[PDB]
Design an enzyme around this catalytic site. Sequence first.
Site, PDB file in Angstrom:
ATOM      1  N   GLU A 138       1.114  -1.279   0.119  1.00  0.00           N
ATOM      2  CA  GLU A 138      -0.208   0.522  -0.601  1.00  0.00           C
ATOM      3  C   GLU A 138       0.662   0.992   0.001  1.00  0.00           C
ATOM      4  O   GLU A 138       1.898   1.541   1.183  1.00  0.00           O
ATOM      5  CB  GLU A 138      -0.964  -0.465   0.845  1.00  0.00           C
ATOM      6  CG  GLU A 138      -1.854  -0.808   2.070  1.00  0.00           C
ATOM      7  CD  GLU A 138      -3.424  -0.936   0.736  1.00  0.00           C
ATOM      8  OE1 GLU A 138      -2.807  -0.045  -0.161  1.00  0.00           O
ATOM      9  OE2 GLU A 138      -3.676  -1.735   0.284  1.00  0.00           O
TER      10      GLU A 138
ATOM     11  N   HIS B 269       3.822  -1.686  17.592  1.00  0.00           N
ATOM     12  CA  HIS B 269       4.015  -1.070  18.880  1.00  0.00           C
ATOM     13  C   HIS B 269       2.556  -0.776  19.286  1.00  0.00           C
ATOM     14  O   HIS B 269       1.772  -0.442  18.779  1.00  0.00           O
ATOM     15  CB  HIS B 269       4.739  -0.605  18.730  1.00  0.00           C
ATOM     16  CG  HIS B 269       6.782  -0.910  18.358  1.00  0.00           C
ATOM     17  ND1 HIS B 269       7.536  -1.795  19.354  1.00  0.00           N
ATOM     18  CD2 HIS B 269       6.702  -0.371  17.074  1.00  0.00           C
ATOM     19  CE1 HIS B 269       8.527  -1.967  18.448  1.00  0.00           C
ATOM     20  NE2 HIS B 269       8.309  -1.164  17.826  1.00  0.00           N
TER      21      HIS B 269
END
EC number: 3.1.-.-
Lengths: 87, 91, 85, 85
Positions: C47, C84
Site C-alpha cells: 500500500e 508497537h
Amino acid sequence: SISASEARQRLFPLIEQVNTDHQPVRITSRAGDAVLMSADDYDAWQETVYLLRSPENARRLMEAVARDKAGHSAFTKSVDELREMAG
Amino acid sequence: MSISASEARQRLFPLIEQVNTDHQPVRITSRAGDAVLMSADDYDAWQETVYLLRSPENARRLMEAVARDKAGHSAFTKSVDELREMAGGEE
Amino acid sequence: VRSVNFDPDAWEDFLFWLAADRKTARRITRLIGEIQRDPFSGIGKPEPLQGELSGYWSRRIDDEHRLVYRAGDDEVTMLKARYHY
Amino acid sequence: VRSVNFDPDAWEDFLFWLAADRKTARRITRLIGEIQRDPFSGIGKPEPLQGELSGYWSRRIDDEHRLVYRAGDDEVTMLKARYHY
C-alpha cells in the site's frame, strides 16, 4: 465485492443499502476498483482520517483516548466557569 | 458539484475511472439518501496509513525512523543472503 | 537486484523476530526479497502510505505487523518491521 | 444538567486558546454548552468517529481544529480541543 456491471444495474438499491447498514460496497472494474459508501459514513470516515493522519495529532488524541478508557484522569468544570474564563 | 443517482448510474463505468484518475470522490444524491463513490485504492491506502498512526507508540517509533531516514545518517546495508542465513530461509 | 538498507530500528525489529518467532523472520525475509526485485507489487498487499508518510509503502507481515519501506531504482530501505502498542 | 469533564490534555488545549486566540476559546465554550444540552446534534457538524475512535464524536472549532468528546446520559468528556502538528 461486485462487478461494475451489476453495480450499474443495481445502483439504486445499493445506495439504499449503504444508507441502511453503513458498510462500504466494493466495486471491481477494468478501469480500477471503487468503494461506494453512504454520504454520512463517508463524512464520518473523512473526519476519522483527518484526526489520525497527522502523526502528532494521532498520538495526542489516542493517548487521551487510552486514559479516558482507564477512566481515572478526567476532572470537572462548569460551563459557567468556562464562559467566565473565556470572557 | 454532486450528481443525481440517475446520472451516476448512467455514467457509472466512466465515473469509476474518473474517481480513480482524478483521485476525487463524487457525491451522489437520491430519494433513499446520499452516497459517495471513491477510489478503492485511495480508500485502502488511507486506512493503512491510519492503521500505522492510530497506536501512539507505533506512531512514535515510525516517525522517529522516518526522521532518521530523511537525514540519512543511520541506515546500513545487508544482503538478503545474510537475512536468509539468519532466518533459516524464507517463507 | 536493488540493494537493501535497514534503519537501525528495523534491524532491531528483525533481531527481535529471530529470537521470538523465526517463522515471522522468514516472512520478513521473503518480503524483502520480493521488494528488491519488484518494489510495489507482490505479496503482503503493498500500500502507498499517504499524507506525511507520503513516499513510503507498507506490506503485511501478518494481520498485525507491517514492514514499512521506501524504494528507489538502486536501493530499498526498511524503516520498520514490527507494530508497537 | 450533563456535567463536563476534561482530559488533562484537552484542558491544556483550552488554556492554550485562552491565551493564544480568545475567540477560539469562546467557540470552544459555546460548543461545550451545546454538547452538554444535546451531545449528538446541533452546531459544529458533529461526526461519530469510526474505527478505534468509535464511540467518540468531533465538532468543528475551526476549519482546522476539532473538539473531540464522548457523551453519556450523565456526563460529557472532552478529549482534545486543538489539532496538532
